[PDB]
């Protein structure tokens, strides 16, 4: 029926896609997540949305959803719409390893999903996914990589980027304190905590509101390790004390 | 032939309204309070019939999925049943492949995957039902909550239905991680007493527990014994 | 607000009624049916001087003995001329004979008015064609010139003008045409009316003309051949 | 106001506007006349002039040897419905090795024409037809309309200003059965003449006459063959 | 399956979804290219570098085949579908024909693809315009331009994206047989046109040159700065 | 039908002046066994057409409900057009040919008699779709044991009468009783004329003489 | 805007697309039928618009099977479709179960095909009311009537057309239970002429048919000899 | 109550999440203008509904709201009669697949749940409207004994000690709810009078023998039987 159809895939008079532009605002209120490309590894610092005290821990993480042995992602957007994407990314990465007997390059896996996220922005009449999610990983060719995929179906490479709430103010801070090629892993852990402070309305970070996962190469094997609560609290205390000595 | 266009679309300010309105149908439903204790999980809901002619032994608001898993709801009655009969099918499809009782965290992800498919595929409205799922696997208790959007959250203790905001703050005070299954049953009954407006009896609620012996709902005789204290 | 299949209070079927108005935004094409052959002349409407005029084909080859002029949206006619070339070969394959101009235009116009948003096929056309094709060529019955409207109504015409200037150009064709005129006079009579309806200057670059003789096959005049006819105008 | 956009929407008066707008298109068409005697059935049609230089149309199509039709409406929808009639008549002679009765062929049209009317997203066939055929029961004038219902007529005229012809046919309808083959066609000519403006007249070029009979199959007469019939008019 | 007509006719014979698709082209980055003698040059104008970007994957100049490449302007996602499906046709053509693709062949395939989604049910047109350059088997350079409507035309010089109305008027006056002679002068003509549509100044651009003897090699950010200095 | 199960035996036929008459004995056969002897293998299609068949009896009942019901469908609308005996012979030939193309044939062999428009029609339809019209027809072993007797009389006298053709059929059906093992004593005789199809009851071949 | 679809209830719980469909029946000429002891007799007031139409055109009496007749009031297009559907329903029954379809079952199979189009927006309800009748040795005479909503009730006599109430008052006092078929034929023709309006609709042709024991359970149109006797008897009582 | 967008037509969530459209399917039940009363005893279960013949030309045996789903299960319908027959054919087809797949007769427990699951599919999909009728099923379970269930357009099949439906549903429920006080409301074969007086009190009709239709299931006779008007007159004369 034409009366009940909302015309999601049409064009605006100005050349815009409404459901794509409106899905971008759902991400602006979503959970704040960022990542930093360094020389020896890459990290993901994501602000945890629900801090409620009666919540328990289920498996290994919250917004992370490790996609493969050599790479993992982080999601900011509709919580349910992120689960369907992660299941598809785990299918694409394994269909590559099944077919070519090699780990999926990060540039190839991002392109594969952005074709699926686009297919709903053109035909089918369905709504697009409201999830913009990052990527971290390592491959045999370009090494450590960091990506960002918008609901419009377009992606891009990033040395430092942030998604979710207060993403505009976070990127502006990363345009300064970040140095291309000079950033190490431990220097990036300090930069991630520095951004999560000003970009969150909370007075400070209690380590239960943030979750950090780093990806490094150890003995020729990519390891994805989420920093525990004791390890994150040490980073917060380091930045909290260093901020006092700077003033 | 059916509509192929999605009824749930993003609003101007970035929100899905059919899901946001589906939460309103849950908020007007019957109170259901799960609590995860140390050795087990208890699900207590308010089963209230509008008259005395209704048969209380006919329908059960607390229904098992498998032997070790059961779940209760706050929301529409019918939208729960098509949902729970599929959750029973997804659990047994797991058992055919892996010949193993399905873990609770695995069943919640598959049920939350179905509740999402109706928030996207065209022609269908979202569910008006929210779930409290309990289970016993790997020697650990599990309590989960599935929203109409398709997002699941692991809870130690929570509440839904009418006056869920006032009820949820009531659990945070009296809940303790060292509580046992017997002590957790009373706290789940006292929460249903918070918003009731009447005189509650054995047939005025429905309670069930999940422990190392499997999930079972308490008979109307056993519920009356816990109402004396 | 309404579907692609609807009838007007006068029964005009708006989507085709609007598809005809899209032809009035296209370039002007003129053709003449003589006893010695048919001629097809069309304005290229060069947008910019950097545009290569050789890449603009408003006159294409259907078969060796058939040729067609196009107007309106150039893209929408690409699928029709492709089905016309397949239809002529499917006839020569099965029946081992050159396909008549009558059956070509009838087979192409069957694609018109066939569209829908409900259970049409796995692939389907959302809208009718906004194009007007002038079919021409020599068949066993002699030279013939046909027209195809977006409504699927094909009509035999001795001389007909299409495009934005079609109004007022048809009035000039009916004055200068007579059944005894030759093809050489038809090529010259076409450019004089084009000179009136073309906004820019008329030269060998911005005009595209081709003829079909009974003895010869379809051939389009090169840049050197067009310079001779223009000098006579 | 909002009831006319869809064919599946009933109006508060128990009326479907979308079907009635389809019956408006057949009255905006060209006037065609047909009638039967106890021997022969004749179709007489005005071939409409879109311009002065254009060979008008062909409004009478061959269905089978014993059946022929006349078109008033959308032309591409007519041959789309006529290709079904031709396939349905070849189906009987293929399977049953007998000519398909004209009364049964029209029943197949009413069943096919209705399906678009009751389903959403589809439009009624906007072409009316005058079906002339010779069965074992004699000549048949059976009429089809955009509404799937059909009528068995002694004489009928459709198209623009066909009411002036129906006035003529209703007057002489008593003497049609006693007419011979030559005199029978002349009644359809006078009936079709009343459908023309005072400044127009019946000529050989704009008139096509179909004829079907017992020992005579269905044959169309071109501009050259209609001269003996126009000699008495 | 979702079957509905998104692109339909309008009063005065207009297609809204097709016309609005061309409005999205004018909202994209500016891509300019010219056709020289033995050389063809493509270039684009990046909106904001920000120095957080990895410049490899954000490139708007792709390669459809060894002898054919294209640069677009429009929605970035809508382009990647066209490039990926055009590369499949270039390889499927070498399979059956056993010859490399002509520049006009792949342009007709892309133009016919942009058309198909205008008249198809439940499918929106592309929001991109493409500039395709290459060399035929005889060695003649080619420059083509496709539109969301599905129409393709050859060009001596063209400009797509925002500000392409002024650049096309700039190329029309300055294109002659002298500037297209030298291989370096052809490169300088594109840069001189790009600097007109770039409001930020300097070189934020990305330029790629594809010759015949040895395939395309995109120029580095340092190599494009050498020509920008000579044109100052 | 890959293999037949319950089969019938030869069906005769001849056309005389005024109509056509055929005869078929009543017996079922499963593996050289007389099992169902009460079965009637002669069908009355409509007023002007009559049919009978040899071969698999199960496939014949299928052609009873498919062909018989098509006659009702033609009589519901009632426009005055009825199926001629050669139009049924043409439809039935097409049905038999479309089955072998799918390699799922009908095992029967059929003889369609009829009288329409003052002309007598008699026609033959086989398993493989081979069809024709002859003045006399016999199926199965009737082609061997009977048709030689039918052709011998019809060669000297091309047109018979109703009584002379009846004695011709009864004399050919008697020969089938002697030399054909699948044959049977009782047989139906049906006749189509200007008054319509009339199917007579069981008749006996018991007048046969055995001299040993 | 509640009336724009058959899948939408009204605030008072009504479906107008089903209710507007039966209003098209009220704009159609009257057709009646009567169930008597010996069978069922049908009659129809058939309005011919132009005199050019041949007698018998737009036939309002259909035979869905050999023992079952049909009479329609409504849009004539939708009437011919349901006739073909009722023929297929009686066709598939005789193939599967091998015997004539009981009209109790036939009226239910057709009523569920008519109702199936009232539940969806992709289709529209039929605009034609129609009646069925038959005769059998075991089952006797039966007359059912199916509304555009898809409901089927049993009737001794029924009226569908322009005047629904006017003919019901004539049939109720008829006392059809003790009357044979040949006596009803004269009574049906009397009811057709009395409910007719000589003002609005002028030209008309009386179409009559029955089914009963005298035909041995076979529905057919009334022969001209009996039909002429009934039309003369009816005009004599019209005065 | 707040309505936004297309709540008023397709079935989706109102701003309060009430399914603004589904609530009108309950109002469509009152369009029939009838009332059904169902009550179960210890050894038996009884269903009683109003039988109204609007015209004298109707056939009384053909107009009934009591249907036989299976041998041991009865039915009574309240709502649109057109939607009624469609839901009964599904209940008969759903109860037949049970016996064919699962080997034994279907309980009244799970005959209502499958019908309630079907009525839900109409509520969740926007392409189809809910049915405008409600089903009341009775029977004798092996272990549980007599069972009385009712499913609605919303898909709510929850059980009953006694059931009311129709226009008088609200009045007849509160009146009969006071008979939830007396033990088993005097439960035995005479619970027929329990249903008759409840329907006779709210309508104030004081029905005759042919004014109502009654049917019962019992432990001694598990088969569903529709009582003859002669047997209904025996219970009507005792009250």
Author numbering:
A (entry chain C): 2 to 248
B (entry chain B): 3 to 231
C (entry chain E): 9 to 241
D (entry chain F): 4 to 236
E (entry chain D): 2 to 233
F (entry chain N): 1 to 212
G (entry chain G): 6 to 244
H (entry chain A): 4 to 242
What's in the article?
The proteasome, the primary protease for ubiquitin-dependent proteolysis in eukaryotes, is usually found as a mixture of 30S, 26S, and 20S complexes. The 26S proteasome holoenzyme consists of a 19S regulatory particle (RP; a.k.a. proteasome activator 700), which is responsible for recognizing the ubiquitin signal and unfolding the target protein, and a 20S core particle (CP), which hydrolyzes the unfolded polypeptide into short peptides of varying lengths. Three of the seven β subunits in each of the two β-rings that align this proteolytic chamber (β1, β2, and β5) are proteolytically active, and between them hydrolyze most substrate peptide bonds to generate a variety of short peptide products. We show that 20S proteasomes can degrade the ubiquitin tag along with the conjugated substrate.
In parallel, 26S proteasomes (lacking transiently associated DUBs) and 20S proteasomes were purified from human erythrocytes. Only a trace amount of PA28 (PSME1 and PSME2 subunits) or PA200 (PSME4), no detectable p97/VCP, and virtually no measurable amount of deubiquitinases were observed in our preparations. The specific peptidase activity of the purified 20S proteasome was further activated by SDS, as documented for the latent form of 20S complexes. In order to better understand how a ubiquitin conjugate enters the proteolytic chamber of the 20S complex, we performed cryo-EM single-particle analysis on purified human 20S proteasomes before and after incubation with MonoUb-Cyclin B1-NT. Classification of the data from untreated 20S proteasomes resolved one class of symmetric conformation (further classification did not yield significant differences between classes). Although free 20S complexes are often found in a closed-gate latent state, some proteins with substantial disorderedness are effective in activating their own degradation by gating the 20S42.
